[PDB]
């Protein structure tokens, strides 16, 4: 959620400034990392209960 | 400037109409049809804005 708010607020900006670098790229990396983390957690807990 | 603005509008028209064709193909998909296939894996997929 923090990262989503970060990207949203950064999107909120005035006309003559709209740029893109690692900041956006690295934040996207954060989001993807997070999602992969959740999926792996769920699979591990499944094996544990079995 | 007039023609430029037109251009943007028709660009949008084109992409949306392509989407309509795709989702008509979606709609009229029916049980026990031909193109149905077991594809596996790609459900938890979101590259979406």
């Amino acid at each position: 959620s923090i990262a989503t708010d970060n990207l949203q607020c950064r999107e909120r900006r005035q006309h003559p400034d709209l740029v893109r670098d690692y900041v956006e790229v690295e934040l996207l990396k954060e989001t993807e990392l997070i999602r992969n983390i959740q999926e792996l957690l769920k699979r591990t807990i499944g094996q544990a209960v079995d | 400037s007039d023609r430029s603005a037109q251009h943007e509008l028709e660009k949008d028209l084109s992409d949306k109409q392509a989407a309509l064709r795709i989702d008509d193909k979606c709609q009229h998909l029916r049980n026990t049809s031909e193109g149905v296939s077991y594809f596996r894996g790609v459900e938890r997929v979101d590259a979406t804005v």
């Binding site: 709209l18 740029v19 893109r20 | 430029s4 603005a5 251009h7 943007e8």
Partner: peptide, 28 residues
Amino acid sequence: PRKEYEVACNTGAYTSSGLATAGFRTAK
């Protein structure tokens, strides 16, 4: 002129700024 340089800069399998031929360009 500018045409050749924009072609040179934006051609690869990497990213792409939509510096179009004419008309309004992308805000980003």
